[PDB]
């Protein structure tokens, strides 16, 4: 658990590292700020002009538990229990 926790966090790609890799602005959309386009990172190098192709159907492998809860199917009597502040 420790050696994996530190490994996952070590491969954590930053917003500017992303902007540089894709060469495009990384725009944050916050529901608490409406459609305000907050630019968190921009490519310091040359910016690109071709809109990244938006694939209508994303070929991402979802996790069943995530979708299970999203659709209100996970009813664990132990999840979201009142606990002391951490």
């Amino acid at each position: 658990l420790t050696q994996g926790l530190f490994r996952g966090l070590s491969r954590q790609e930053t917003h500017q590292q992303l902007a540089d890799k894709k060469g495009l602005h990384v725009v944050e959309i916050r529901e608490e700020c409406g459609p305000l386009p907050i630019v968190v990172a921009s490519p310091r190098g040359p910016l690109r002009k071709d809109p990244e192709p938006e694939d209508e159907v994303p070929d991402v492998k979802l996790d069943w538990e995530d979708v299970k809860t999203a659709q209100g199917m996970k009813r664990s009597v132990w999840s979201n229990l009142k606990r002391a502040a951490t």
Binding site: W78, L81, K82, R83, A84, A85
Partner: protein
């Protein structure tokens, strides 16, 4: 066990006593419930003070008598509300007993109501899509004839004295089962004052 800050509960949190015991962390930062297991009970203790007797490990509020949960003590109240979501923590979150959490809840609402505590006030839309004032509800309704003449809306509302022959007819029918004849009723209730 009386507090000098009873009347000015805002002063304790400003004094150096507070700033030495707590500093910048909330008063509940160092409270750990004592409980069986790894998952705490979902309800905290009812009250830490029973008949002026303090329990073993008193909650944050009940271990310092100088902490008065008043709608005026805005600083204390702020500690028990999210600084990011504007929500009152649950009692298990901070460990304040059931008694104090309810008092706190009232205090939070009172300060918020009185304008002492800041909270998000959303921008709402108008109630009515159309503001036209052409409907009769706002216009003038033609008064009814009976209303104009101050008459009972329907004629049979008023008392109509029955004819003598008709009145006598029923006396024949209900012989031996008759009440005292009643004259015209008083127009205004003769309610004895």
């Amino acid at each position: 066990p009386i507090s000098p800050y009873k009347d000015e509960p805002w002063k304790y949190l400003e004094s150096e006593e507070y700033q030495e015991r707590y500093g910048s962390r909330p008063v509940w930062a160092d409270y750990r419930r004592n409980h069986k297991g790894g998952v705490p009970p979902q309800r905290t203790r009812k009250t830490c003070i029973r008949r002026n007797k303090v329990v073993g490990n008193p909650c944050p509020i009940c271990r310092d008598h100088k902490l008065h949960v008043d709608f005026r003590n805005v600083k204390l109240l702020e500690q028990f509300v999210c600084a990011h979501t504007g929500i009152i923590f649950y009692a298990p979150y901070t460990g304040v007993c059931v008694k104090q959490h309810k008092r706190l809840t009232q205090a939070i609402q009172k300060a918020r109501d009185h304008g002492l505590l800041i909270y998000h006030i959303p921008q709402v839309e108008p109630r009515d899509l159309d503001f036209s004032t052409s409907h009769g509800a706002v216009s003038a309704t033609p008064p009814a004839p009976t209303l104009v003449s101050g008459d009972p809306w329907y004629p049979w509302y008023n008392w109509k004295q029955p004819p003598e022959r008709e009145l006598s007819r029923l006396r024949r029918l209900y012989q031996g089962h008759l009440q005292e004849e009643s004259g015209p009723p008083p127009e205004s209730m003769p309610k004895m004052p």
